[PDB]
Amino acid sequence: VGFDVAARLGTLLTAMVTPFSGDGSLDTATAARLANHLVDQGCDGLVVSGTTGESPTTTDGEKIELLRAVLEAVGDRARVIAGAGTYDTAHSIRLAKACAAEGAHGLLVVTPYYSKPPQRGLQAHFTAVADATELPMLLYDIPGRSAVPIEPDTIRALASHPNIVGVKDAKADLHSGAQIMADTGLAYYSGDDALNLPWLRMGATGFISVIAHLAAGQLRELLSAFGSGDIATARKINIAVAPLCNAMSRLGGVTLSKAGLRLQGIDVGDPRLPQVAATPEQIDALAADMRAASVLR
Amino acid sequence: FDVAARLGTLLTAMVTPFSGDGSLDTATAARLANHLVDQGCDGLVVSGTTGESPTTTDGEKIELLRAVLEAVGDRARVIAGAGTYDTAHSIRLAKACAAEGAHGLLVVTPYYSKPPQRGLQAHFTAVADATELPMLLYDIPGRSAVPIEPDTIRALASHPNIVGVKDAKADLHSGAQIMADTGLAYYSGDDALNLPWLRMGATGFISVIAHLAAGQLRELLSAFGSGDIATARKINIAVAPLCNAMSRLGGVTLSKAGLRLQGIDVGDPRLPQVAATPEQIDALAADMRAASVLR
């Protein structure tokens, strides 16, 4: 009875990178190969064109092409959530309709960045995007990038929308999130790998993860031990993958994910400017972290 | 290169007028542009933050640039906002603005995605290489979520097309030292710091409150220019009530609402920005009357 967010949206999702070819164009063959690899390693959902998928530097056309290719590769067996939010409500609406019509399983909608709308602007924005399609929708709260939080009262007001079902949380408000989950029934996903385990303690449904690019099997094991009550094993795994969160703070998710995947034998090309490929020295520093975390020989 | 002549000293980050249904209103853009220059602006920035660059299309940005160049380009400098978080997009938009006849470019730090400094360096170089227009960096970590660090600005200072900085970072003495070291022109990108920026050697203001108080800011620049800092301080305090309202509303909501209160209807913001509420408009009218820009 009731809408089961864990089953309908997933528990381990990667915010998948968008592969580009040598010339910079979208590489759907590799997007498909990567999607199969991440699901095979233990992800039960994927987010396409989130932040780590370089949503700022791809077109709507590329976003929809990518989504098509990923639904084709894994959509039968994993949930495919489409990133659709920007700082432009009219545009987010259009993009959310296009992803829905393409067959997406849910939407991930970021707080409008840069322009710093007031909370009632955010409420109006998220509501409008939620009214656009039948897709289950996740708010994406990340004041570190967007410059404004989704305030607790805004989240509460938004919980009454029939389509808004959860939050990807990168605000590290663990105490408030636990109370919001308790009061509203919203599903929280960790949107910061360094807080995967603390979020689980608070009631989080799962992870929308960057480091699952490299360590999806270990994060699967982590979720699986945590969910059974073997917190001790979950904590052990979390400690073991810490060098990846260290490399994350050095490089940021886009640089890290594309360079680590290449180190792991899955070349997904380089990022589009202003994002940058890791330098040779950063690649060597990255490799040492991946070895330490047991995701590279 | 004469930055003051070529880019101006008093500029407004002009709002983008919309008609009642929300579409671009170029005839109102033209009138507003004329009113602003009349009041004392010797330049205008189009499609800045205050011009709602986030919610307008490239198409609307070009139409707007054309309307304002046509309206005032003969007597004021027209600077085109061409920065986004996408280098290939910023390149095309810069070329588009150049091809229409923009006098200069304003290029914000890539927002949201937080590229590293070496990525910023690559981004600004590539944009500055796309056209022969003089370009200003627009450093606003409060919005973009990363600053342009001073070593990065010093590196970019050697690009022949990069002539200055719209500084919304509040690094006064560090900006003063860069100005002295490099010859880069600084403009205040914060009304709350307009006078301190002048004392640091800034060339002028790319202002929000100039929508409502250009004449007073023109007099502040003149009084500073003639070394009458007492008067400049007096004028600074006189207009500070507009900063009270800006803090409550933000620039976009404040500029559209305030203009409408002065008899220049420029329509509302586009979502996720919002029109001021009735009670907000009353509290704004109080602030405007306190700043003497409303009867």
Task: Give a brief outline of the structure.
By secondary structure, the first copy, chain A, is of the alpha/beta class. Chain A has helices at 5-9, 28-40, 60-74, 89-102, 119-130, 143-146, 152-159, 174-184, 196-202, 212-228, 231-240, 242-251, 253-263, 280-292; strands spanning 12-16, 45-48, 79-83, 106-110, 137-141, 164-169, 187-190, 206-209.
* Relative helix content of chain A: 40-55%
Q: Tell me the total number of β-strands of chain A.
A: 8
CATH architecture level-2 label of chain A: Alpha-Beta Barrel
- How would you classify the quaternary structure? homodimer
The CATH class designation of chain A is Alpha Beta
Greatest contact between two chains: A-B, 35 and 35 residues
Strand content of chain A: 5-15%
- Principal-axes geometry of chain A comes out as globular
Number of helices of chain A: 14
What count of domains describes the coordinates of chain A?
A: 1
Q: Please summarize the sheet with the most strands of chain A.
A: 8 strands, parallel, barrel
Rounded radius of gyration of chain A (Å)? 18 Å
Q: Any idea of the CATH topology of chain A?
A: TIM Barrel
PDB class: transferase
Keywords: dihydrodipicolinate synthase, dhdps, dapA, dimer, RV2753C, Mycobacterium tuberculosis, lysine biosynthesis, Amino-acid biosynthesis, Diaminopimelate biosynthesis, Lyase, Schiff base, transferase
Assembly: dimeric
Entry title: The crystal structure of a dimeric mutant of dihydrodipicolinate synthase (DAPA, RV2753C) from Mycobacterium Tuberculosis - DHDPS-A204R
